[PDB]
Design a protein around this ligand. Sequence first.
Ligand SMILES: CNC(=O)C[C@@H](C)Nc1ncnc2[nH]c3cc(Br)ccc3c12
Length: 167
Amino acid sequence: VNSFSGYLKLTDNVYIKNADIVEEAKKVKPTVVVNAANVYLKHGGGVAGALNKATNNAMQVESDDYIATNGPLKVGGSCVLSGHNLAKHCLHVVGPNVNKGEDIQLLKSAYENFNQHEVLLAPLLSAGIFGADPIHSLRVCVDTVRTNVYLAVFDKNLYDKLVSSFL
Ligand SMILES: CNC(=O)C[C@@H](C)Nc1ncnc2[nH]c3cc(Br)ccc3c12
């Protein structure tokens, strides 16, 4: 039993809700919140900009030190950093950005990072400003993640479409 509330169950291990991931993290304080990161950990907009804003820019300060030490992530890769006031940990995961020409096949590799964590609160990778089809992202999530994932979808119209079209 966990504290996630109001989710629709899609499969044995995947759950979904129309919710602002920032507000959801603040309420649940999950062990892991997933950020929709880029390779530079520049949290300017989309989910990343919103999560970082909620940390009062502490996420960005920590991220800049991480990059200065380690260099950029790989597309499809991840790193674990602090969750600040939102969660114990933040798993920064880089899905391919279609608006940069990146290989959509890398979306499966991106979701594989979730399997290193027993339970996660997450957005749909490569959705939103990353330009991928969210219906496809949900399909890859369900077919790749084996651990327990609670998906927050900000847009109500999109949430209803994802549920209604789910096979
Ligand atoms: C239409 N874009 C998506 O669907 C992409 C998806 C990854 N974005 C989000 N997903 C879940 N919760 C979220 N809260 C937010 C608050 C702010 Br401001 C900006 C974005 C999000 C956000």
